[PDB]
Amino acid sequence: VQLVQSGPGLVKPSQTLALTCTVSGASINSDNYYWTWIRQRPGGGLEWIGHISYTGNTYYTPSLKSRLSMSLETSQSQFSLRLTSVTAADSAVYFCAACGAYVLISNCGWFDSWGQGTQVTVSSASTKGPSVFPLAPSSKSTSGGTAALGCLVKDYFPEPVTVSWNSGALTSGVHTFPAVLQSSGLYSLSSVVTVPSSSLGTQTYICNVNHKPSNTKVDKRVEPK
Amino acid sequence: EIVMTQSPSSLSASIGDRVTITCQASQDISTYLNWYQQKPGQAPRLLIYGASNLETGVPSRFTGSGYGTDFSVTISSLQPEDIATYYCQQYQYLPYTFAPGTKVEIKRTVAAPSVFIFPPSDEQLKSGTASVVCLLNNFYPREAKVQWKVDNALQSGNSQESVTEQDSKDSTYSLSSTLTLSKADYEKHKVYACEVTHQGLSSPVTKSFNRG
Amino acid sequence: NITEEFYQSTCSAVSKGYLSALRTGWYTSVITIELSNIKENKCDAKVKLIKQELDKYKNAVTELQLLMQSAIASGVAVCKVLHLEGEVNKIKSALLSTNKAVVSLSNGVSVLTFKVLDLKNYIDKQLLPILNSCSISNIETVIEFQQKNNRLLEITREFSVNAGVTTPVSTYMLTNSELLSLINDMPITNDQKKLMSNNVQIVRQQSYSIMCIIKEEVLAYVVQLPLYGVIDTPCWKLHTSPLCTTNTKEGSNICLTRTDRGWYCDNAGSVSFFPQAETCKVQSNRVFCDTMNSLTLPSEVNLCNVDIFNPKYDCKIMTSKTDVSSSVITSLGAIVSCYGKTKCTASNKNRGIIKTFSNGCDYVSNKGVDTVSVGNTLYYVNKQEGKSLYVKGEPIINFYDPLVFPSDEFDASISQVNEKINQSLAFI
């Protein structure tokens, strides 16, 4: 079973959060399948939200019962989640998941299938595309044979940002750091590659930034001096 | 709601070691306990279902044990591809609950960080701010200390660090410290330095530049 | 050991020499079959057969799940406790390392629990490692699963066609060895344990299997077993037949029949009377009955056999003028009520007719008699060994004046009949 999540990364407070998960490999109405939703608060453990059965029966966690809604859309082979009156305490990565069994005599609690997850941020702030600045290599960033360089992805909102080097051709020695929340409301992260110093001046290094929450894709050439 | 206790909170072990994480539930949950493995940036992965059964595609070195209130998961020989966080979860009673987790780090010999410092780009200086980045690359253990000296003046409260998760290839870490100044403040001073203290360095190391 | 007395005076017969075994209470055990959860099934002639059994297993589980959407009041109460959350888990923990365990339920009832079949252990060590290489080249693994699953299918069938309550308790519900050891662990005397073990077929007939719950891979049904709290007291069976006058003119005859026929057993200084037949089962000279369908009578009720006009107990009779012929086959002979023009005889297999009955109520023993014929109805007699005693006496119907005899009393007695006779005589 393959699971693909669709949902917004930014949601204004006291609104309703709408997520859908598209199932491949088994019918939404197949026997003993329970479509589960799980959320993971930042830097924390997992929290089981609830599930909806192949027949349509739903169980919501007692904490969120008043604000939760789940439904089946068999024609599009997908199930959905709705959380209303959201606040900043509901910002998390929301995981579509599925439990299925050939013979089931207990609760279906093993989640062998998962979706990639949706990073949901709940804030009254507006999305902003990042500003990308090069970290040029010099003598202060050369240690023997290899030299370091990178780019600085600064002042964006909300998470996350996708960073590539040379469209994906450069992958060894790449270190993209976890983002940091600055003193303002915005984020910032850095990506760095270590490279044979002899190659500077003869090979092109370009930093590929992709920020989907604002339809932003930025390419910046990183060059010596 | 059922409380789940996982022990230890985090552990480090050499490659090939025997690693065991235990799990305890507030009350008896029979055989209805799962084990999950989650690496950074990815969804969890089911390792053990029904206390002891091994999920298809999981290496043989994962073993599940226990019944009732006390359970455990065991890695027969720890490997680089196992650097992750491990969760146990119960499903006898609704709502299903997870444990806080257990971080797993690989232990290796002490490696000194390669220190690099980057001045602000002229493109950023037009915008009005200036960021100086100092990079500590491929060191172990994780504990490291970085502090900035703008004209031999210790800075405080304008720097932010970020650490990578442990690289499975060489079991090291990397760190990035970013000193943020305004263009006006940045052009009033000349020397910018980061002073790195680490266990793999006999004496603190300093990387600095001029023309600020 | 079995003896019988026929009373000519009242056209009745008492068979005695029987020993009591009266069900006074109920013992409830919880019988469990540990089931299992099957994550996936994905895959060759031998393995194809295994998959057919897996389908029978899955279908059986589904049927039992669909299934879950006074004599057994106690068993039903135990089933209700099993539906509370955590309750099944208590049993699961008790039976983790043993098949027999006593478990106190949440309502304080301490029940004996019995794991009679462990299908969970079998599939998770043998089959589950194999269902995710698909290559099973020996016949003995196939056989064990077919044997073990066949029982589950039949138990499921029984509950499915009995609305979750079965009787007698089959050997699928509880094998002979399982039942015998359950009896051994019961809180009863050695005499009680011995009686039940020597009559396991009767114990099954007086037991109930009550389908309770399938939850958390445990299928559990309650087997409700009889407790025989009264043993080795005397029992006797009263047989009765119509006693009529034999005047020549048709329709001028009057009849009398002792009512309350049935089994009687001494019990705690009184006599237990079981009016509805079939509630007692007779094996040899031991008689198993059920006390919920009995009356408790003064022990003076016995006087109706020796002296039906005694002033201390009002013997029950019915009256009519319907002098039809019939026979009652007793334990050790046959009562023949022969009236009008009916030819009534008793014959032996090889010798032929050996007694021809005259008009009246009469009796013949089973010694040398195989059949009795009254009119066109042939009766085979019981051929069990035992001595009979014929107690001669004038038929009491001759003591009544036919001109004042009440022939329209069904539920009646000597005193009631006397009272009514007194009223008709007063007006004359």
Author numbering:
A (entry chain B): 2 to 35, 35A, 35B, 36 to 82, 82A, 82B, 82C, 83 to 100, ...
B (entry chain C): 1 to 212
C (entry chain A): 27 to 69, 73 to 98, 146 to 208, 211 to 506
Sentences from the paper on this structure:
RSV F is a class I fusion protein that mediates fusion of the viral membrane with a host-cell membrane, a process that poses an otherwise insurmountable energetic barrier to viral entry.
The structure revealed that CR9501 recognizes antigenic site V, but also makes substantial contacts with the F2 subunit, consistent with the results of shotgun mutagenesis. The light chain interacts with four of these regions, forming a salt bridge with Lys65 and a hydrogen bond with Glu66, both of which are on the loop connecting β2 and α1 in the F2 subunit. The disulfide-stabilized CDR H3 forms hydrogen bonds with Asn63 and Asp84 and a salt bridge with Lys65. A rigid-body motion between the trimer apex and the membrane-proximal region of the protein was present in the monomeric structure.
